[PDB]
Design a protein around this nucleic acid. Structure first.
Lengths: 229, 229, 233
RNA sequence: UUUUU
């Protein structure tokens, strides 16, 4: 009767005449210690050169220490390490280091030069503003499952959904609406309740995002519109 | 004078100074017989689990029998088999079986549980409504090239443009206006004329379409909108 | 201190505790002389069969003369030659040859049969209209960096943003708003100032683009709107 | 013409 959806069952589906019918929080706690031996600067460098580093990881089977990032994006186990999972851990680690003030001055100084931080025009004032900076460009639904990261993920997802045009995010490459949906799905999965305290924290995050800011098309906007008309 | 486009002729073109100059309807007839050895239920299963199957087919060079679907999306020949072309054939196959009364009851029963049929709220009464059900989710411009499928393709395309909001179709992923245009290009290419007989058929389809009718975000929606403003 | 981005350096980044950190105008002037030995017909043929020629170059490491277009799209140097960089230069060569009247009639005659010219319905009357014809399908932000090519690039970019639907430009394949943005970034980078003389020229370009001429949907529109009104439109 | 719902 009914079988499991496998690659062979799809082949059999097409070639026979027979009737045929068909948690990251845990991952984080177990793999965070492994990357803790990285440097704060090493973490910020990974973030700073994410896109460039990503290309190198995807060239072939990238193995570092006991961990290996497979070339096959398909079939990834709860133990398996993807680039997104590696990228996310490093951000979670950096936020944890925001609990120490000495690291906060290191991160705040260095992350102020990051490409994404300037594009968002993010004001880097207090600890919450620095934490947001670490979040920029990160896999929000993944990070949202980690405790105390629920609000910071959804506020940034909302911001990315509202201002996707201003941030220059291509909707064809990144569904900014789908991302927010998955974040909410994550929170409901771990029965996250949005009481006033969570809303209290989120608005403080949103306050930083609100105060944040093409620049070239604005420089020629007065003469560009005459041709437009 | 004029020469053939070859790799060497481009080298001569760039390095010398001498003057140098250089249909799914068919696809269906040739590949439909191949998938006819499938079961009626197996076809309906493919439709029901299209998205799930889609991911698996795109995993690697998917080969079933003598046919192989390549991973390389670029450079696809008129003979080459894509997932959408496979999907289209199976729907065309299923519609052909709507000419049999035994199959009509079989298809009608199974496809009533399909996700798209329920989302559209499509009433499955007569043969034409069942045919519409099979069409849901299909590559309309492809199917439009097959004879007698012109009206059912363009009428459904028209409907998707009118009720795109009600159907929950994301404009960023699917240009619903562009879709209707591509269907018309196919029809105009084979000189299809919408006389009284054809428009009559379409109106019968349109009558059925007229009578037709995220979750995690709804949970946090009340507190979510505050950040949106 | 700072090191080069290599596969080994990423491993060191992730497994160790050490502190670890990682213009076409010039390109044109240095590479334009090389393509000058081509024929006008050779240049115009390249324009006519761009997509078909493009695929052959992408087949393998395509080498012509001392120049080689590598298959590896990643890591392209300021000296390295890509197809888009190759294609744009050929257009630049062709536009420069519009300053001579003999070539002007040759280009006008040949390029009038080219796909983009016919699809855009571009009227080929004077020299400026001919220059516009050569630009169609070209890499605008690259060419915009070449001097005297600034206004003609941004005016056409504006037009491509406004009429992207009528021109059959696929938004999933080509962000026509991003295109206009990149051109402006180039112009602001070389401090291009849009004074009265430039805008005057641009409007002459824009006038030609205005004068140029879904299509298949209008053919059925009489019996296409009858169904729209059934669905409440 | 290719791709996603």
């Amino acid at each position: 009767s009914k079988v499991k959806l496998t690659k062979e069952n799809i082949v059999a589906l097409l070639t026979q005449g027979k009737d045929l019918e068909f948690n990251f929080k845990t991952f984080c706690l177990e793999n965070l210690d492994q990357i803790k031996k990285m440097s704060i600067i090493s973490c910020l460098t990974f973030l700073k050169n994410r896109q460039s580093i990503m290309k190198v990881i995807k060239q072939s089977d990238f193995t570092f220490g006991k961990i290996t990032i497979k070339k096959t994006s398909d079939r990834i186990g709860a133990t398996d390490m993807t680039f997104r999972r590696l990228d996310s851990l490093i951000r979670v680690r950096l936020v944890e280091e925001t609990g120490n003030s000495e690291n906060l001055n290191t991160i705040k100084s260095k992350i102020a030069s990051h490409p994404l931080i300037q594009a968002y025009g993010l004001p880097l004032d207090d600890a919450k503003s620095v934490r947001l900076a670490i979040m920029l460009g990160g896999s929000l639904p993944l990070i949202a499952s980690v405790d105390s990261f629920e609000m910071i993920s959804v506020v940034l997802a909302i911001y990315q959904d509202a201002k996707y045009k201003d941030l220059g995010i291509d909707p064809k490459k990144y569904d900014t609406k789908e991302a927010l949906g998955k974040v909410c799905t994550v929170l409901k999965s771990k029965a996250f309740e949005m009481n006033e305290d969570q809303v209290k924290k989120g608005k403080e995050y949103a306050a930083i995002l609100s105060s944040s800011n093409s620049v070239a098309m604005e420089h020629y906007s007065e003469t560009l519109n005459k041709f437009y008309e």
